[PDB]
């Protein structure tokens, strides 16, 4: 029976609508859901707007009226200009009348805020259409109607707030540039009268709900009004005294004073400087006397979360940081403003102790600005000594782990600046916090961790001598703390923090070889501790120390028989015997970093040979047994050994790059034979067991071997220095091993990593292997396109790697596309346009870049038959495909590159840089310029796609577009204007003449 309202042939039963709406808002389960669907179909009926004035008059349900206003809003915003003037004036007067009537009834004003606010927004949508050109008296009549009633006055403040938001805050995306400018100038022209009314209400006072609504509208005005309305009236004084004293007005007043602090203000005027000081002094005095003194425990207050305390304290942090970041110099050179300056900063110290991450970050951004200033600005640090001392304790007690990247960075930078400003105070706070870990008073895992992160963060800031004494003191103390602690949980925590601290002080390690040596040998002992976190931390600390101190492992240190790298390699089996595979790979990666420091080739190659001894011997015995009998691979355990050998090679190649070549050369031939043998096993497992085989641990293990081989080759080729050897030794066996295997596997068995490996090969040596690039395209192009051209979802990794490969081929070896037969070239153009339609931002962006690069590649060919045949066949396909993704609202992330592509395409024709006619003969006079025909083709295309536009709108848009096809920012402006106009009927064609 609910479906009754969807039958428009019969007059609407308001009592039935009221029941559906009640069922939706107050009902449950299946009933709610059905009411939901019916209400949506009702609202979306294009004639539903004719039912609105009936529902507004005769409904008892305020939710029905709300939904009626939503229906009205779709008409006003999309189709308003289709209505006769009489009908528009009728709706306008009904809406004003309904608002005034609801406001004059005290009961309705109190209880129907939802429906009044929705009515106010509906009126503002009418103003955007009608005002001021067709409604010059609106503002005068609103000002007039405001003295008739306190309810109407308060509601008029809501209307003016929403108007200001719609015109100044949200216009950029929702209106044409010309229409936004028109409404801004219109509000600007009449603001004097609006302000007069707002000031009177604030002066005349009385009703708090009216005062709050007026201050809410002022917050919006402050985004755009000139400073003189604030500084040349009593308003600064009222905001910073009266409105700070009462808690109803205090939150909004603080937000107003924050925006006052951001007004554009003359810089060379002592009276304005004094007014800026005064409102700050007044605001802080009202806080200290009516809210809380400077000493108050804001951490405790915030935590207790009474009433609006949390929002108030957030707003105070925003006010203090905004004002002081701009104005603290106003308070710094006058002795009588010193107390105000330090009290403001003392409130910020108290706010900084609140346990609230997002508030802490806001105060931390201010502290960064201040201590950066004290670091560089002459004669300022002494002012803030006591503020800085308290801030050192706040930052040290709040230090997060370096894994929280941005917050750790911000904290580190503040602490480094503070350490420079007073190294003795920083050291004393850190040593005394350590003492309270040792005496147990502040002991916990969190507390020793946070302190260790803080101590780590200031490495490099002290003089080498001060650092030396500090580091020894800290390590001695953490060692004592470790001894003192009982049970492996506690000891592991302190051991990880010792490893952490030592790893952060490379300058100290580099100066003290005996210390560094002991640290490494101690890290090697910890690599045998199965206690959770200890092996991982030992390996992470080892590679971190090696990255910073590698030179010390590659020279012979005095009183050593050999470079320490030889000692590490000699004992590597024993050292790594208890590590998990990923930890062994880190260890081998670290050794690779050291070995790359050796610039003697013979000695480097020998260290590399010695490091790879264990994986090379495991490899050799497998290749002997594996080739002697192929069936030995099927064994789960051998697959794991082979993958871990390849991963060890990847790890060492990651740190050695070009230097890795001799080791790659040792395994290369048998590694590509193993790639082929594993490929056979996957193929015949899929044949025997079905596509499900690709999910089995055995086939995933085999595929891991193929992916690590491709990863090893891409890792080497991406860092290779000798490209002649890459082309002469590596490329041919690689293409033979991987391309046909990729092509001749079923989609589900094809490795996307093949596309990734080929991208690096084309990137690095594409110019040197034209025939190899042709072979890459022939093997991967059509079979990969067929995997990804059925939907936007299947084979997401192939999708991404496919367009990265086409992008690099189109940049480096475009001749490979000239070699394609016409039908394959057509599939390439189809593939590019397919990329444009993607919502996945990786593919879409590569798609548009390939299109740009392709146009550039064709332009480069000059006036020749392939270029001419490209334009004749594809120019209009690229223009229409680009316009499609510009206008369909489903591809907004690609806007910039769509615009750049369309600009290139239009500029080609505007410059007469296309030699042949784009039209086929007897379609237009044979003289006809490509410019005239492009005009005609676009006018026709836009007219059919957007039949509600006038010929005038389309012609003006295209006239603007072609004139602006050398000015990207203006062109984009015109495109955005067009995207606004296609959403409505009767868009003004003169909007496309806009100039700033």
């Amino acid at each position: 029976s609910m479906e009754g309202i969807l039958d428009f042939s019969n007059d609407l039963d308001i009592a039935l609508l009221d029941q559906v709406v009640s069922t939706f808002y107050q009902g449950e389960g299946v009933q709610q859901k059905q009411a939901q669907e019916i209400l949506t179909k009702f609202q979306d009926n294009p004639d539903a707007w004719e039912k609105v004035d009936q529902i507004l008059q005769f409904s008892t349900n305020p939710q029905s009226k709300f939904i009626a206003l939503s229906i009205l809003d779709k008409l006003i915003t999309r189709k308003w200009k289709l209505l006769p003037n009489d009908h528009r004036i009728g709706i306008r007067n009904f809406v004003v009348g309904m608002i005034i009537s609801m406001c004059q009834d005290d009961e309705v004003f109190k209880t129907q805020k939802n429906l009044i606010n929705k009515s106010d927004l509906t009126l503002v949508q009418i103003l955007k259409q009608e005002w001021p050109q067709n409604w010059p008296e609106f503002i005068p009549e609103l000002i007039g109607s405001s003295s008739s009633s306190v309810n109407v006055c308060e509601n008029n403040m809501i209307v003016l707030k929403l108007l200001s938001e719609e015109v100044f805050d949200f216009s950029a995306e929702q209106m044409t540039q010309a229409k936004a400018l028109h409404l801004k100038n219109s509000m600007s022209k009449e603001f004097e009268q609006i302000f007069k009314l707002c000031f009177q209400v604030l002066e005349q006072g009385s009703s708090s709900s009216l005062i709050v609504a007026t201050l809410e509208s002022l917050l919006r005005y402050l985004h755009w009004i000139p400073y003189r309305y604030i500084y040349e009236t009593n308003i600064l004084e009222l905001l910073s005294t009266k409105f700070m004293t009462s808690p109803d007005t205090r939150a909004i007043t603080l937000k107003c004073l924050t925006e006052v602090s951001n007004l554009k203000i003359p810089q060379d005027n002592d009276l304005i400087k004094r007014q800026t000081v005064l409102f700050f002094q007044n605001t802080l005095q009202q806080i200290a006397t009516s809210v809380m003194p400077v000493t108050a425990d804001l951490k405790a207050t915030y935590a207790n979360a009474n009433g609006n305390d949390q929002s108030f304290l957030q707003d105070l942090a925003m006010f203090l940081t905004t004002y002081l970041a701009r104005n603290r110099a106003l308070l710094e050179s006058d002795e009588s403003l010193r107390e105000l300056l330090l009290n403001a900063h003392q409130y910020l110290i108290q706010l900084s102790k609140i346990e609230e991450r997002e508030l802490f970050k806001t105060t931390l951004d201010y502290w960064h600005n201040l201590v950066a200033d004290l670091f560089y600005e002459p004669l300022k640090k002494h002012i803030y000594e006591e503020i800085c001392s308290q801030l050192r304790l706040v930052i040290i007690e709040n230090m997060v782990r370096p894994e929280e990247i941005q917050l750790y960075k911000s904290e580190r930078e503040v602490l480094v600046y503070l350490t420079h400003l007073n190294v003795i105070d920083t050291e004393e706070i850190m040593i005394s916090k350590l003492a309270r870990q040792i005496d147990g008073s502040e002991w916990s895992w969190h507390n020793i961790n946070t302190l260790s992160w803080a101590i780590g963060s200031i490495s490099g800031t002290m003089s080498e001598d001060t650092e030396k004494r500090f580091v020894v003191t800290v390590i001695k103390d953490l060692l004592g703390l470790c001894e003192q602690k009982r049970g492996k949980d506690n000891k592991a925590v302190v051991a990880r923090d010792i490893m952490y601290v030592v790893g952060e002080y490379p300058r100290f390690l580099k100066a003290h070889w005996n210390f560094l040596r002991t640290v490494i040998l101690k890290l090697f002992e910890f690599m045998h501790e199965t206690h959770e976190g200890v092996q991982d931390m030992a390996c992470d600390t080892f590679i971190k120390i090696v990255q910073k101190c590698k030179y010390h492992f590659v020279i012979q240190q005095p009183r050593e028989s050999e470079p320490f790298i030889q000692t590490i390699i000699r004992d590597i089996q024993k050292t790594t015997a208890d590590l998990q595979p990923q930890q062994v790979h880190t260890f081998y990666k670290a050794c690779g970093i050291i070995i790359s420091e050796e610039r003697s080739v013979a000695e480097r190659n020998r260290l590399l040979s010695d490091l790879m001894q264990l994986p090379n011997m495991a490899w050799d015995t497998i290749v002997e047994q594996s080739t002697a009998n192929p069936t030995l691979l099927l064994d789960s355990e051998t697959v794991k050994i082979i993958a871990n050998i390849i991963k060890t090679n990847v790890a060492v190649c990651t740190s050695m790059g070009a230097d890795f070549y001799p080791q790659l050369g040792h395994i290369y031939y048998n590694m590509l034979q193993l790639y082929r043998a594993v490929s056979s096993m996957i193929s015949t497992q899929v044949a025997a067991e079905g596509l499900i085989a690709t999910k089995t641990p055995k086939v995933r293990g085999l595929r891991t071997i193929k992916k690590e081989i491709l990863k090893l080759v891409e890792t080497y080729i991406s860092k290779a220095r000798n490209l002649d050897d890459v082309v002469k030794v590596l490329v041919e066996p690689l293409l033979n091993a991987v391309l046909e295997d990729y092509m001749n596997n079923v989609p589900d068995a094809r490795d996307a990593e093949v596309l990734n490996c080929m991208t690096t090969v084309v990137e690095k040596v594409g110019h040197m292997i034209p025939q190899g690039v042709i072979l890459i395209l022939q093997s991967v192009f059509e079979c990969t396109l067929d995997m990804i051209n059925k939907d936007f979802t299947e084979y997401p990794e192939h999708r991404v790697e496919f367009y990265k490969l086409l992008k690099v081929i189109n940049e480096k070896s475009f001749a490979a596309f000239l070699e394609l037969p016409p039908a394959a070239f057509k599939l390439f153009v189809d593939a590019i346009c397919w990329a444009f339609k993607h919502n996945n931002r990786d593919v879409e962006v590569n798609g548009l870049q390939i299109a740009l690069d392709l146009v550039k590649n064709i332009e480069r060919m000059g006036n020749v038959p392939f270029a001419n045949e490209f334009h004749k066949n594809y120019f209009f396909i690229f223009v229409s495909e680009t316009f499609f993704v510009l206008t369909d609202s489903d591809h907004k992330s690609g806007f910039s590159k769509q615009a750049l592509l369309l600009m290139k395409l239009i500029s080609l024709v505007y410059d007469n840089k296309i030699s042949v006619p784009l039209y086929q003969e007897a379609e237009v006079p044979q003289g006809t310029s490509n410019q005239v025909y492009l005009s005609q083709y676009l006018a026709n295309m836009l007219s059919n796609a957007f039949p509600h536009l006038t010929s005038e709108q389309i012609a003006s848009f295209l006239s603007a577009l072609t004139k602006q096809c050398k000015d990207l920012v203006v062109f984009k402006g015109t495109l955005r204007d067009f995207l606004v106009q296609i959403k409505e009927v009767g868009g003004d064609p003169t909007d496309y003449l806009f100039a700033e």
Partner: protein, 209 residues
């Protein structure tokens, strides 16, 4: 038991439905099926202050599937605004969702959630996310996929709605489960159903669990 209307808003594909479903059933839905208008689901948490029920209005982010739009916000007592940290446009649209929401719901606790922080290539950097500050929104980095901070939006809203800053999620005692006898008539039924299930692969076999 106290029940509060929670409205979930944000761009299409930001993870609103995924996040709710994970909370309702524990499942991770990999597929994008765009919400049509709104989906309403009751969601209960057990706290040291007793059970709290959220009536979750999971709204459509796509304009063409928007349905009643701000009609869904009427009498909301709390809200989540969702964006995707892998999609800059979804953060650019946060002020538009906030505008439409607070025009209907003027004084409600609101959490801003940056979803999909599990994805390595993050596009909306920590430094860029400041919109919550002047609007007094709580902010969390979340992942519906890794469960990073997955409970935080509800725990924060529960503290705000109950007015107890020390409210915690608790474990409800688990009843002794029944001892039953396998029906001899449906023993053939069960071997079939188990065959289908053994030969369908578990998803995400590369994850830590």
């Amino acid at each position: 038991q106290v029940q509060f209307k929670l409205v979930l808003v944000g761009d299409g594909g930001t993870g609103k439905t995924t996040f709710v479903k994970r909370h309702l059933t524990g499942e991770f839905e990999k597929k994008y099926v765009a919400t049509l208008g709104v989906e309403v689901h009751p969601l209960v948490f057990h706290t040291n202050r007793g059970p709290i029920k959220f009536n979750v209005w999971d709204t459509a982010g796509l304009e063409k599937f928007g349905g009643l739009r701000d009609g869904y916000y009427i009498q909301a007592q709390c809200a989540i605004i969702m964006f995707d940290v892998t999609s800059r446009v979804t953060y650019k649209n946060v002020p538009n969702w906030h505008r439409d929401l607070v025009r209907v719901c003027e004084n409600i606790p609101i959490v801003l959630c940056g979803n999909k922080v599990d994805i390595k290539d993050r596009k909306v950097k920590a430094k860029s996310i400041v919109f919550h500050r002047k609007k007094n929104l709580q902010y969390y980095d979340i992942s519906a996929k890794s469960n990073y901070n997955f409970e935080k939006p509800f725990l924060w809203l529960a503290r705000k709605l109950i007015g107890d800053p020390n409210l915690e999620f608790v474990a409800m005692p688990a009843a002794a489960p029944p001892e039953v006898v396998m029906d001899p008539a449906l023993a053939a039924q069960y071997e079939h159903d188990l065959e289908v299930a053994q030969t369908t692969a578990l998803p995400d076999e590369d994850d830590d669990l």
